[PDB]
Amino acid sequence: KMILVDKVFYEKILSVESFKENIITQSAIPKISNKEVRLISSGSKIFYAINNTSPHSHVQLRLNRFFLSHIPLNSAAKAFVRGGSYLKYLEPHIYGSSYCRLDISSFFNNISFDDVKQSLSPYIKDEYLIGTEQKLIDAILNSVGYESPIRKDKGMIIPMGFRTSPAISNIVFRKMDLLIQDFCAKKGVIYSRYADDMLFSNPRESKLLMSDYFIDEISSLLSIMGFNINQSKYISREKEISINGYVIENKGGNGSIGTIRLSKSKLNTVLKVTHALAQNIPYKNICNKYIKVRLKEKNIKYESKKDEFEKKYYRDQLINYLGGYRSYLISLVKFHSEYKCVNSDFIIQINGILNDIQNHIQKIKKNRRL
Amino acid sequence: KMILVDKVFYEKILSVESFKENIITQSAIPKISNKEVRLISSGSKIFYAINNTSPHSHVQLRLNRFFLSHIPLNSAAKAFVRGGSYLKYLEPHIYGSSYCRLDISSFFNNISFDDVKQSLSPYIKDEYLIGTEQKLIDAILNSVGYESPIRKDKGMIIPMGFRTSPAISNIVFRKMDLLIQDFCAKKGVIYSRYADDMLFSNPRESKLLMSDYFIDEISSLLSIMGFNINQSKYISREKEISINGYVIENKGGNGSIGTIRLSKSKLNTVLKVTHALAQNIPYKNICNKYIKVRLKEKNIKYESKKDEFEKKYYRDQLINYLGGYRSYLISLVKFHSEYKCVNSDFIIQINGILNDIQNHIQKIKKNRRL
Amino acid sequence: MTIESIRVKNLLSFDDVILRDFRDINCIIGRNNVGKSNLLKVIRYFYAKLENKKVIPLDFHTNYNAVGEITFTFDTTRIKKIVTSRKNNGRFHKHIYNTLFKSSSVKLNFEELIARKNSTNKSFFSLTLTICKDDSVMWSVDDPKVRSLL
Amino acid sequence: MTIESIRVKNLLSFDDVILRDFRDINCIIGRNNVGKSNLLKVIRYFYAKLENKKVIPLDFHTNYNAVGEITFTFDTTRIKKIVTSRKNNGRFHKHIYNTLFKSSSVKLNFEELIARKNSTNKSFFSLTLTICKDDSVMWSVDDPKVRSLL
RNA sequence: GAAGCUGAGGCCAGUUUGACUGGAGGUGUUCGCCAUCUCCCUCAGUAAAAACUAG
DNA sequence: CAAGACCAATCTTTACACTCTGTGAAGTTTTT
DNA sequence: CAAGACCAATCTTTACACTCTGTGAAGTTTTT
RNA sequence: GAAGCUGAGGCCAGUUUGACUGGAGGUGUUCGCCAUCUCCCUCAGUAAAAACUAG
Numbered sequence A, B: 001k002m003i004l005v006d007k008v009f010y011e012k013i014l015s016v017e018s019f020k021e022n023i024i025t026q027s028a029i030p031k032i033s034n035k036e037v038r039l040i041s042s043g044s045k046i047f048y049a050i051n052n053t054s055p056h057s058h059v060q061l062r063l064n065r066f067f068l069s070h071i072p073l074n075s076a077a078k079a080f081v082r083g084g085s086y087l088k089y090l091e092p093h094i095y096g097s098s099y100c101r102l103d104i105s106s107f108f109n110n111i112s113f114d115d116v117k118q119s120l121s122p123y124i125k126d127e128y129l130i131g132t133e134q135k136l137i138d139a140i141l142n143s144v145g146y147e148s149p150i151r152k153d154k155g156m157i158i159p160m161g162f163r164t165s166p167a168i169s170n171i172v173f174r175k176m177d178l179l180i181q182d183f184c185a186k187k188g189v190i191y192s193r194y195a196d197d198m199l200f201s202n203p204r205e206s207k208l209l210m211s212d213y214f215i216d217e218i219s220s221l222l223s224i225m226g227f228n229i230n231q232s233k234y235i236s237r238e239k240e241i242s243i244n245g246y247v248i249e250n251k252g253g254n255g256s257i258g259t260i261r262l263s264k265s266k267l268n269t270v271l272k273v274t275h276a277l278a279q280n281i282p283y284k285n286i287c288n289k290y291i292k293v294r295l296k297e298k299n300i301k302y303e304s305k306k307d308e309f310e311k312k313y314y315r316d317q318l319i320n321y322l323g324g325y326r327s328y329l330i331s332l333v334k335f336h337s338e339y340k341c342v343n344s345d346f347i348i349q350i351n352g353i354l355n356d357i358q359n360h361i362q363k364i365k366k367n368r369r370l
Numbered sequence C, D: 001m002t003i004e005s006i007r008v009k010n011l012l013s014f015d016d017v018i019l020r021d022f023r024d025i026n027c028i029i030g031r032n033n034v035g036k037s038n039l040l041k042v043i044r045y046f047y048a049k050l051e052n053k054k055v056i057p058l059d060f061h062t063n064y065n066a067v068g069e070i071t072f073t074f075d076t077t078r079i080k081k082i083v084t085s086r087k088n089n090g091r092f093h094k095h096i097y098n099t100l101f102k103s104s105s106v107k108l109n110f111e112e113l114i115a116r117k118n119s120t121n122k123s124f125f126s127l128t129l130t131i132c133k134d135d136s137v138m139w140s141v142d143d144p145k146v147r148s149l150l
Numbered sequence E, H: 001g002a003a004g005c006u007g008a009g010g011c012c013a014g015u016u017u018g019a020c021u022g023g024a025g026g027u028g029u030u031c032g033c034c035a036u037c038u039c040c041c042u043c044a045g046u047a048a049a050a051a052c053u054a055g
Numbered sequence F, G: 001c002a003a004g005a006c007c008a009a010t011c012t013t014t015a016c017a018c019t020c021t022g023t024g025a026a027g028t029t030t031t032t
């Protein structure tokens, strides 16, 4: 039974109180104004952040909780989904012998809003929420989408960091996930996707993934709804590939099993932090030099205790970083225990690093009481 | 039960007497020397004709009769095969809405001899015909192939006009017929081939046949054994195409039936001949101007009767041409009666032209007795 | 009439067989082991796949062909007369119009439509089922409602 | 051991289910309508397709996936010990060598082969059957002799 | 480099002071000489396979 | 210029030994 | 630059009339 | 036209008479900074979703 939303569904469990005034006075639900959205710059990328006090944030959150979480997705989408994780994206490819990796350029900016409307239409009943002026689907997309002030030409845009944007991206790209999965299956290729990074693997002894034909076919498919392939990040290798530090290897031939292991570049930062901890480097220097976390003087809440405040903050930040990396490798260990696909010697190295991390966190906590 | 040939099969029913001397003295079967092959020029094309007195011609003929006629072929090959005809090549496409036509450049010259050896190997037992010097398969290919004196670089070549060359071409191209047929079937396209002219038709409302992707895919397939597509003869049309004068039309949409009809360019010559016959033009002028048949003075066998000889020869040639075109349209009528796919009004026009042809041949025969 | 032709290519014992010019009674005679029931199996499989049943595809006559085709040419002249008329405005008639004869009279223009109406009406519907070497089945008409209605 | 793991993706009642660490006796318990016999049906279909039988493909859990995969990881350590040894020169042993463990020890070099021989031997054979949306079936190993021998 | 193209000449017309290009029109069109209606000569050289001899 | 997709047929696939258990020390038309 | 292949779900598909028959004239990591 | 790229500066080293480029090595390699072994500072700004808290 698919999820259906009617007028009562929006008015009772979705809106609750965010748009009570609009529904009692029959006033049109307004666009997300620029006053509610702040524009952050990170790299060349631009992020859009909504203010929490606005009712749009709350209705986005309850939309995410109750509506977008029930629409079926494609199993090739491993990101932003309940139970999906990067290791799951990198696992089906342990069976492959040749690997290829593609990227979609500006995935979130290139999502057409009309495609979002078409994708969400079957799951929302066609009614008139506000008299005969605004339809229910129109109000919901008014809640979900946004108009970019920097680029007014392209009109309504699903922005980065709008709470509901990832789930909507998965839903609107389910069509292409199905198309590309069908094509790869007919070619005998294992396909998976994380956000916009696509990974293909051939378990047979063939050069299909290294050919220009495969790129051309994937691009031809992606042009159906207007996406493009980032040519700078295209990668194709044999018997071993490294994706953001996680190395998948398969030296075997017929019926062989590969292994996934993080490399030393990935563990460089944690190894350096443990080395600095063993060298009795002060905590402030460790936090600033490696963890790029610093206590700006404008962030200090009170002037009553400041010398103690800085030390406690840096102690807590080091504890939090060590615990975070401890849980990141525990995730690796759990994934290996569930699937048995991580390198055994790398499992030994993980165990050693985890014991070192635990001992260092114990030492820091013991020093906290001194 | 596939056809298998052993030493006794070659020595008894194939050779019979052509290579008795070589098999009794255990002497190697020789290459087809240039003395047995004459080189004709027709257009830019070059034809190779073997002499009848040579034993190679007779063994080629009995090879064609008894061996190459039993190897299974691909039903998409409509040429040079028992029961295959051009109308059969042009018929499966009456169901299509869009048409495309491709050509293979120098099909007979581009056939690799090693491919012929590989194709014929499973059907000929691996033995030693002549001591330990020449194998049976080697002797048979010595009979079948030839070395081009003009182009010695490419080595052994299957030439045009070597009796057995068409059947061997079909056998060696069965592999690509299977490949291309499978690809088209997965794309939902009807495919047929006559010699080297390939015809594809899409019965669905789509632009697949007009796209560059289809040409690229067919060329990529054809590059497996080294063929190429003649880019000058590539054609793609919708709802109507004309192939060497035979027009296939299908104006309909879902579940429609097209019709095949010859056009007026095709019937221009026969209409002009009938017009000249009705205008009492002398037979010599009709034969020379339209039928491009002329009595060269070097061809006259006897000088006893020459004025009568020329008249009788031209009378017989006109009778033969009229009978040939009569049987060509009778073939069209029979094909229509068997499949019901020729235009009805064109059937009426064929009936009229056939009655005119029969009346003219009757008049000429009656005048023969005067 | 009902069926104009039935064509089988490379399926069971048939290489390329076309049966047409059907009459009211069609007596089939022949020696034992000549394929008389193979026609029955072919038609039965075609109609089972017409209603989207899950059945095993039939075997190919020879494996040197990558396809096996079954073609049925239904004669819809009388149904076209039934449904095109303005009197029959029922819901079944409306469904038959909106499924079969719509999108076929759409492409024709006024002159050709009037020529078809006034002259001796002869309309056919050709449906082709192609079985590939990997047991996939492809139709020449991609609307399953059309096949179920046929 | 015999079987290292069994993985089913999007077939019958399974979304992504992996069963591993098998013991000598494996008791399966659960409520009515939870898929206990669906494992039986999946394994039975996998083995029927292993011997190239003609059967209907199993239904997909959800139709929003274009594939359905069954993966079997056979444990061939003991068979590798059986066949690799120089004493067993029989014809069945020679067939097992020339079908399974040849072309797998071919790619390895002398150092890696000696490391596999001397250390604790652990060899697995992973076979994946993928059912597409159009009822076609594709294997990850294209040699039918391998599947029949398995 | 890869691709593609057509037998050898002689008057007459069109472009050239001196040699090169075509030898029914109408209509439509995907512009393909593609489709449909009506009504220049000479001389060489011309392999093979299949279909087809209305009813 | 160059490339993934390179037919379908074709041959005993069921155990060995030391180890009673372990696997090892003179027509038309088409292609042309 | 530009293009074939553009999810899977979603709604009474069984007869009409004049004509008894014919249909029509404060964590890590990843995407980023 | 289409494609792609990175926060703002200050000493020190390398290329420059006066400003620009990097701040472990070894080994192998598909040459990708890709893999494996051993051992510079400051100041801004830093949205979202999911996985993960060994046993």
Ligand SMILES: Nc1ncnc2c1ncn2[C@@H]1O[C@H](COP(=O)(O)OP(=O)(O)OP(=O)(O)O)[C@@H](O)[C@H]1O
Pocket: C012, C013, C030, C031, C032, C033, C034, C035, C036, C037, C038, C039, C059, C060, C061
């Ligand atoms: N799967 C198949 N693949 C190939 N040929 C087949 C297949 N099944 C049947 N045949 C062939 O078709 C024929 C089967 O006999 P069929 O039942 O079709 O004829 P029949 O005339 O109905 O027989 P009967 O007279 O006994 O009723 C045989 O020639 C057999 O070789």
Ligand SMILES: Nc1ncnc2c1ncn2[C@@H]1O[C@H](COP(=O)(O)OP(=O)(O)OP(=O)(O)O)[C@@H](O)[C@H]1O
Pocket: D012, D013, D030, D031, D032, D033, D034, D035, D036, D037, D038, D039, D059, D060, D061
């Ligand atoms: N073709 C199918 N497509 C989708 N789901 C199916 C299909 N066949 C069965 N199922 C689902 O799988 C389950 C079938 O019960 P199953 O026999 O697998 O469980 P079981 O535990 O063996 O039952 P029991 O306890 O009675 O033996 C049900 O949940 C049913 O919905």
